[PDB]
Write an enzyme that holds these catalytic residues in place. Structure first.
Site, PDB file in Angstrom:
ATOM      1  N   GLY A 168      -1.036 -10.833   7.540  1.00 32.01           N
ATOM      2  CA  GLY A 168      -0.003 -10.451   6.591  1.00 32.01           C
ATOM      3  C   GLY A 168       1.421 -10.563   7.123  1.00 32.01           C
ATOM      4  O   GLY A 168       2.374 -10.551   6.346  1.00 32.01           O
ATOM      5  N   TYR A 175      -2.440  -9.514  -2.952  1.00 27.40           N
ATOM      6  CA  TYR A 175      -2.549  -8.162  -3.462  1.00 27.40           C
ATOM      7  C   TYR A 175      -2.893  -8.247  -4.932  1.00 27.40           C
ATOM      8  O   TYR A 175      -2.108  -8.785  -5.725  1.00 27.40           O
ATOM      9  CB  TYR A 175      -1.226  -7.403  -3.336  1.00 27.40           C
ATOM     10  N   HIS A 186       9.504   1.766   2.581  1.00 25.96           N
ATOM     11  CA  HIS A 186       9.529   1.288   3.957  1.00 25.96           C
ATOM     12  C   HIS A 186      10.391   0.028   4.130  1.00 25.96           C
ATOM     13  O   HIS A 186      10.777  -0.632   3.157  1.00 25.96           O
ATOM     14  CB  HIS A 186       8.118   0.960   4.428  1.00 25.96           C
ATOM     15  N   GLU A 188      10.144  -3.693   6.421  1.00 20.86           N
ATOM     16  CA  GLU A 188       9.063  -4.483   7.019  1.00 20.86           C
ATOM     17  C   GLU A 188       8.813  -4.163   8.489  1.00 20.86           C
ATOM     18  O   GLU A 188       9.718  -3.702   9.193  1.00 20.86           O
ATOM     19  CB  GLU A 188       9.360  -5.973   6.860  1.00 20.86           C
ATOM     20  N   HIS A 274      12.385  -0.407   0.679  1.00 18.34           N
ATOM     21  CA  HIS A 274      11.973  -0.726  -0.678  1.00 18.34           C
ATOM     22  C   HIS A 274      10.658  -0.031  -0.987  1.00 18.34           C
ATOM     23  O   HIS A 274       9.952   0.445  -0.080  1.00 18.34           O
ATOM     24  CB  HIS A 274      11.851  -2.249  -0.872  1.00 18.34           C
ATOM     25  N   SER A 286       2.193 -12.561  -0.261  1.00 12.87           N
ATOM     26  CA  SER A 286       3.357 -12.321   0.588  1.00 12.87           C
ATOM     27  C   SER A 286       3.073 -12.528   2.072  1.00 12.87           C
ATOM     28  O   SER A 286       1.905 -12.583   2.492  1.00 12.87           O
ATOM     29  CB  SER A 286       3.892 -10.896   0.382  1.00 12.87           C
TER      30      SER A 286
HETATM   31  O1  LIG Z   1       2.114  -3.712  -2.732  1.00  9.53           O
HETATM   32  C1  LIG Z   1       3.066  -4.511  -2.876  1.00  9.53           C
HETATM   33  O2  LIG Z   1       3.250  -5.264  -3.863  1.00  9.53           O
HETATM   34  C2  LIG Z   1       4.097  -4.610  -1.764  1.00  9.53           C
HETATM   35  C3  LIG Z   1       5.350  -5.136  -2.041  1.00  9.53           C
HETATM   36  C4  LIG Z   1       6.316  -5.247  -1.054  1.00  9.53           C
HETATM   37  C5  LIG Z   1       6.030  -4.831   0.236  1.00  9.53           C
HETATM   38  O3  LIG Z   1       6.989  -4.940   1.212  1.00  9.53           O
HETATM   39  C6  LIG Z   1       4.751  -4.298   0.538  1.00  9.53           C
HETATM   40  N1  LIG Z   1       4.439  -3.882   1.779  1.00  9.53           N
HETATM   41  C7  LIG Z   1       3.268  -3.362   2.116  1.00  9.53           C
HETATM   42  C8  LIG Z   1       2.254  -3.220   1.167  1.00  9.53           C
HETATM   43  N2  LIG Z   1       1.086  -2.675   1.567  1.00  9.53           N
HETATM   44  C9  LIG Z   1       0.002  -2.541   0.577  1.00  9.53           C
HETATM   45  C10 LIG Z   1      -1.043  -1.530   1.095  1.00  9.53           C
HETATM   46  N3  LIG Z   1      -1.534  -1.921   2.430  1.00  9.53           N
HETATM   47  C11 LIG Z   1      -0.429  -2.111   3.397  1.00  9.53           C
HETATM   48  C12 LIG Z   1       0.577  -3.152   2.866  1.00  9.53           C
HETATM   49  C13 LIG Z   1       2.515  -3.629  -0.151  1.00  9.53           C
HETATM   50  C14 LIG Z   1       3.771  -4.192  -0.464  1.00  9.53           C
HETATM   51 NI    NI Z   2       6.115  -4.384   3.185  1.00 13.24          NI
END
Ligand SMILES: O=C(O)c1ccc(O)c2ncc(N3CCNCC3)cc12
Ligand code: NI
Ligand SMILES: [Zn+2]
Length: 351
Positions: A168, A175, A186, A188, A274, A286
């Site tokens: 990832g 997703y 959070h 990144e 975000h 992503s």
């Molecule tokens: O869920 C989204 O669309 C999403 C969008 C933007 C982000 O920066 C994310 N970062 C982490 C993340 N998770 C989902 C649950 N397991 C760990 C990673 C989801 C997202």
């Molecule tokens: Ni993220």
């Protein structure tokens, strides 16, 4: 000074590149930065209409989601903590059936503000399933523009030097969303950039706080969750913390909101906090990436101090390659460089 004059409101910007602009990924990021996009922490890029990354999404019902998570949310007064419950493997077909069933499907509404109100009202009830962190890509093998499987940014230096892959982060995640599935507040890992493409389905709504105001959000969150903050130097990286827009308003934290539609890209920038939620059944892809400006964020990223399997990228190779004059000073712990969140990445010069 010139960078502080661009997007001084630090609002979320939206771009519509032509095909010629679209082709060079790293070059376009530099361009939107030259227009101040990064100041929002989040930007939308709508790709030219003649572009598609896959012919048909009719052939993926058999695709496996190895680790769907049920999202249990607890809290009140706009402050929540999300606990994950891993469920048994399931296919996209199975997932979609559940998503669209009366039990889990999207409620009716008129304006987006109405759905948003319903999200914040019902987020602790009837816990949904999120088909998150699925290893894979939905891009056709021959798509050369904005291909999440191979953006060719300097983040490639990690695998190239060390052989290390981080799922990832320098590989793609899929997703599968349903109504009211959430991603917590959070930035990144290593404060990298990310790219998010919504292949199909219902929208995904985002909130963002300008990097220039990131520290304020952190101070607020520490006061709200003093227990979590005491236990870890960067608890938001657990990605369990949900905070409503009203709560942000109430405490003077600047933020913007934007809704992503199928076929649209979202870019998140280094140190952009975000969070958001899905409107209904959908599918997003992503991964992370870097520019030269990210390196300094990388060196300074405040990392989760309490969990193993937390993401840490060795900054050595980047500092040697791109900051050779600072290498010895940095190894000796005396690099006191201060980040200007308004400056665009160096690559933006041509613009
Ligand atoms: O869920 C989204 O669309 C999403 C969008 C933007 C982000 O920066 C994310 N970062 C982490 C993340 N998770 C989902 C649950 N397991 C760990 C990673 C989801 C997202
Ligand atoms: Ni993220
Ligand atoms: Zn931690």
């Amino acid at each position: 000074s010139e960078s502080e004059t661009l997007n001084p409101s630090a609002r979320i910007m939206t771009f519509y590149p032509t095909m010629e602009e679209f082709r060079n990924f790293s070059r376009y990021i530099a361009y939107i930065e030259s227009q101040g996009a990064h100041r929002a922490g989040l930007a939308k890029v709508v790709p030219p209409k003649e572009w598609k990354p896959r012919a048909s999404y009719d052939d993926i019902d058999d695709l496996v989601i190895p680790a769907p998570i049920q999202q249990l949310v607890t809290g009140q007064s706009g402050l929540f903590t999300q606990y994950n419950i891993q469920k048994k493997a399931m296919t996209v077909r199975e997932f979609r059936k559940i998503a669209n069933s009366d039990k889990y499907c999207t409620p009716r509404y008129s304006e987006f503000e109405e759905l948003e109100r319903k999200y914040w009202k019902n987020l602790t009830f009837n816990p949904p399933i999120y088909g998150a962190d699925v290893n894979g890509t939905l891009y056709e093998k021959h798509v050369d523009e904005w291909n999440i499987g191979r953006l060719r940014t300097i983040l490639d230096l990690v695998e190239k030097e060390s052989g290390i892959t981080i799922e990832g982060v320098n590989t793609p995640y899929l997703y599968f969303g349903m109504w009211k599935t959430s991603f917590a507040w959070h930035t990144e890992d290593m404060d990298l950039y990310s790219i998010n493409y919504l292949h199909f389905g219902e929208p995904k709504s985002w909130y963002s706080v300008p990097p220039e105001h990131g520290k304020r959000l952190e101070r607020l969150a520490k006061g709200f969750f003093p227990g979590s903050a005491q236990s870890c130097e960067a608890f938001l990286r657990h990605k369990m913390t949900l905070i409503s827009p009203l709560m942000l308003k109430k405490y003077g934290i600047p933020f913007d909101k934007v809704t992503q539609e199928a076929g649209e890209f979202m870019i998140t920038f280094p140190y952009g906090y975000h969070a958001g939620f899905n409107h209904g059944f959908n599918c997003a892809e992503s991964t992370n990436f870097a520019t030269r400006r990210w390196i300094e964020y990388g060196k300074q990223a405040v990392l989760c101090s309490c969990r193993k399997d937390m993401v840490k990228i060795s900054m050595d190779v980047f500092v040697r390659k791109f900051q050779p004059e600072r290498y010895k000073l940095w190894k000796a712990g005396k690099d006191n460089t201060v980040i200007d969140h308004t400056l665009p990445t160096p690559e933006a010069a041509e613009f």
